[PDB]
Design a protein around this ligand. Structure first.
Ligand SMILES: CC(=O)N[C@@H]1[C@@H](O)[C@H](O)[C@@H](CO)O[C@@H]1O
Length: 130
């Protein structure tokens, strides 16, 4: 599914993401916006290393989920990458929380650095009641 902006904001808040490991909801929203356009079924194949990015947060199969077809991969979220393509984002949120429990935090998503870091991200939660 493609979330509407404020629908996603409230969904993420109910799943405990506001301030998780210090990350504001608006940062999670900025991440989802620029990774997938709020699209839970999005996939991106990376021909350079044979990995695939999955779901609304475009979490990568080399380290975080298992899709069986990524060489030399691990599965730190202990999920099938299929779980990151559901309309219900609970599993994707659990995996995103696992990602940011590692040292880089939200910087683990390279695109967050380019699109959200040191930027005014509040527009993404304006009017959503969060
Ligand atoms: C949290 C996450 O999945 N980050 C992955 C990162 O590890 C990978 O090296 C980059 C390259 O495509 O994609 C994403 O940023």
């Amino acid at each position: 599914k493609v979330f509407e902006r404020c629908e996603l904001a409230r969904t993420l808040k109910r799943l405990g993401m506001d301030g998780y490991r210090g990350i504001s909801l608006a940062n999670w929203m900025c991440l989802a916006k620029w990774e997938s356009g709020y699209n839970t079924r999005a996939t991106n194949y990376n021909a350079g290393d044979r990995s695939t990015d999955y779901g609304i947060f475009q979490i990568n199969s080399r380290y975080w989920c298992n899709d069986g077809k990524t060489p030399g991969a691990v599965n730190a979220c202990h999920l099938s990458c299929s779980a990151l393509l559901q309309d219900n984002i609970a599993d994707a949120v659990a995996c995103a929380k696992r990602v940011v429990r590692d040292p880089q935090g939200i910087r683990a998503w390279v695109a967050w650095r380019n699109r959200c870091q040191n930027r005014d991200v509040r527009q993404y939660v304006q009017g959503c009641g969060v």
